[PDB]
Scaffold this active site. Structure first.
Site, short mmCIF file in Angstrom:
data_model
loop_
_atom_site.label_atom_id
_atom_site.label_comp_id
_atom_site.label_asym_id
_atom_site.label_seq_id
_atom_site.Cartn_x
_atom_site.Cartn_y
_atom_site.Cartn_z
N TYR A 158 -3.29 -0.74 10.11
CA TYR A 158 -3.16 -1.06 8.68
C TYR A 158 -1.80 -0.64 8.16
O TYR A 158 -1.09 -1.43 7.51
CB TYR A 158 -4.25 -0.35 7.89
CG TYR A 158 -4.19 -0.61 6.40
CD1 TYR A 158 -4.83 -1.69 5.83
CD2 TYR A 158 -3.47 0.24 5.56
CE1 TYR A 158 -4.81 -1.93 4.47
CE2 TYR A 158 -3.44 0.04 4.20
CZ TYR A 158 -4.09 -1.07 3.66
OH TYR A 158 -4.03 -1.25 2.31
N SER B 193 0.88 -1.17 0.00
CA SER B 193 0.00 0.00 0.00
C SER B 193 0.91 1.21 0.00
O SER B 193 2.03 1.15 0.52
CB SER B 193 -0.85 0.02 1.28
OG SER B 193 -1.69 1.16 1.36
#
EC number: 1.1.1.385
Lengths: 255, 255, 255, 255
Positions: free
Chosen positions: A154, A141
């Site tokens: 996350y 990400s």
């Protein structure tokens, strides 16, 4: 064809929706065999019915369970004869600040996003070592490079993904097992739409516009645009690449 | 096709040898029109004669001269009708320590590797603004990310390339002009073989063996392996990528 | 005192204003000897008259002229007996898009920000090699790491600074010459206030409020906050650091 | 003084040995109150006897247990009146390749190195939010930036640390809580000496010589050299720094 994916076998975790499903479509379009390991049966079966393709197989898999990971790898080898590419795409987002986050929620994020990647990779590597070559692609990400606001667990998990990627690349390069990651920005997927609405004021269309504007390209990415990066990383076009992180973020991390 | 490079016009600086020529071959293979801008006229003309491909054009160009850069861009527009992709691949390496380096040598490195990239980009961008879209691909280096030993001016120029890439990506994203770079490791080209021999004891083969060992993949890259990254960056497969640096280094920067 | 800067000799380029002058004050406060190399003779002489400090020396220097760089280094050595730390702080900002930028302006930015750093470092290194030790601190920028909008030549120059930092660190570590850089965010100096007003509509206070908001800390940095990083990098505290970049940006690059 | 650490209360996990203990000494030397949270009671009590300092308190703490983390934070607040700085230094290394690693060992590494950092930070942040300010310093590693060979779980955990650092910086900057990390290279501690011997052929001295050579500075770091970076990050000298990683690696990551 220069990409040379035809008759390769690709195992995609989290393949029954979103980016994972775009990847299924992209790889099937290259005449690769695809094995989807995902946790939801109905959703996996709907994918199989829609695709109606003998190159596709669904294996229900909870990647936080090691036996299930082993079984998914075996399913690929049994169904199609081998395993050329593992795509660790499964991941979840729970939104909570560190000072309030439940340990059980922290653990859920790390278990799916990082432990499951470890366990899948472990069993794929046992096969790929014996086969003399392989390719692992991890979905990282932007959040593995910089911090997205309000999703610290996350982002932490994705920093783990980034370094796991580099580590397996360094350790397995002598075995001709290339390991790379893609670092998506903000992608327009139904799961993200849900998160958009839950975590921001406004209508869906207003929030999508807001999220689009934080990127230089002034749009969200489409899942197919991340699938296409995965094609490249699996393909022979990327033959001198290992330990690479490829941003696909509309310019987000360039500013 | 998914790459969608047929009939796109691609201007490649330093295209008449090495990685540049591998890029010529790769783009011609996708039925793109290719304009090579390079400094040695005989070499360019010999490439054209050998290739015997009506999609190839050569224009002698010293990229350190602004008028020549403008002329190269114009040649693409006049010859093939437009300009879709600029590949700023020209570069030089001079080996010297900072404490001994001549200012004239420092300037040469920066002028070819960085100023020439600016001047080519300036004139390509004028066109691409008016076209409503474009794509610029810069040849950076591992040396733009970490320091290769003994080539500090080169490394500095490549840090400049990295940041020029990101800057043009940020400033031109709203104009649908994507700007990315490739960061090659140690690539086996006749030009690098010269540097190998000049800067190390031993026969060429002995020195190549030593250079191979410093990468996790345990081999030097081939020019086609960088060309193939350029193909991806020019193609629609990379449509959500801008301001990205793609390392193609056999794992070098992962450790 | 653990920083232990008393009687160290520090040469600061661009030291007669802004961050450079905050550094002068910080170092004099630590009883270091400070030599300021800067281009404006009247400004330098006024600084010396105001500070009224025997530990301060001003030498007029155009860092784009190699003879002037050599003379600045020599003046530190002759005045205070040696040269322990070089701070390459001089820099300029010109605002222009690539597609419109004059070559002369591009060259000015690179000449001051990058070539001048090379020339100062070259001559400082000759001294430091002979001394058996040294320390070079370069003023980089957030713009060496990500692209600030609308200042592409500046960002390119600072990517050059980043890599020149790493290169000198690698090449001179065996000589006990440590080389690091600071990467400031947006710093509130009178020179930046002038740029704010020149390049934006609104009052100074409106423009400052807008610039503050782009950083997690929600404020601009003070020049002393960058001088304090320089104190650390010069000090004994940083003895195991070389080739590193210290960001001081209120969190800008963490998002 | 300029660092302004006198009477600040600093909680250091893993403080009873190695880098942690060097940090204890450094902070006590600045007249800060230090609370050590570490797992071995006898080792903590021996540290307390040796330091013989009323500004030091030891609290036995298993940081993988949330109640123990909460109790450590409470002990700091009850013993010294508040908590200004949390240093998450605890970590472990287990050497195993991904394809062979036991899940139980993976989990041990992640639990100590990353989950414990989360849980300590969670409870420290609750206090710091109420206090209106704070500072968190995390011990990352070179392994958070590039992959050290043969310790993939460790590297993964440290990538997590890096991103957790950035995330807390971004999320808590508005609350005047700065969050940074240090990325040490290879540091000479008794614990590392044990790992050296366990994982390499040769005498201790031979192995240390080999490990020293991989760094440009050609030596291992001392634990005090990391403690000194922690002083800087806790101090007011670093007031404009948040979300920063400071490498202290003898140049390792610059090449």
């Amino acid at each position: 064809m220069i990409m040379n994916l035809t008759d390769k076998t690709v195992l995609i975790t989290g393949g029954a929706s979103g980016i994972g499903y775009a990847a299924v479509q992209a790889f099937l379009g290259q005449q690769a065999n695809v094995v989807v390991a995902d946790i939801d049966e109905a959703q996996g079966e709907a994918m199989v019915r829609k695709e109606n393709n003998d190159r596709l197989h669904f294996v229900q898999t909870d990647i936080t369970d090691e036996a299930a990971c082993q079984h998914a790898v075996e399913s690929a080898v049994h169904t199609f004869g081998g395993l050329d590419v593992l795509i660790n795409n499964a991941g979840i987002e729970i939104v909570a600040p560190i000072h309030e986050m439940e340990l059980s929620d922290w653990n859920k994020v790390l278990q799916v996003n990082l432990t499951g990647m470890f366990l899948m990779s472990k069993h794929a590597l046992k096969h790929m070592l014996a086969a003399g070559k392989g390719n692992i692609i991890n979905t990282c990400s932007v959040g593995g490079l910089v911090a997205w606001p309000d999703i610290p667990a996350y982002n932490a998990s994705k920093g783990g993904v980034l370094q796991l990627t580099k580590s397996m690349a360094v350790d397995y390069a002598k075995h001709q097992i290339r390991v790379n990651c893609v670092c998506p920005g903000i992608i327009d997927t139904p799961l993200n739409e849900k998160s958009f609405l839950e975590n921001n004021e406004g209508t869906l269309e207003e929030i999508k516009k807001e999220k689009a504007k934080v990127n230089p390209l002034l749009r969200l990415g489409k899942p197919e645009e991340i699938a296409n990066v995965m094609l490249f990383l699996a393909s022979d076009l990327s033959s001198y690449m290992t330990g690479s992180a490829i941003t696909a973020d509309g310019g987000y991390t360039a500013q």
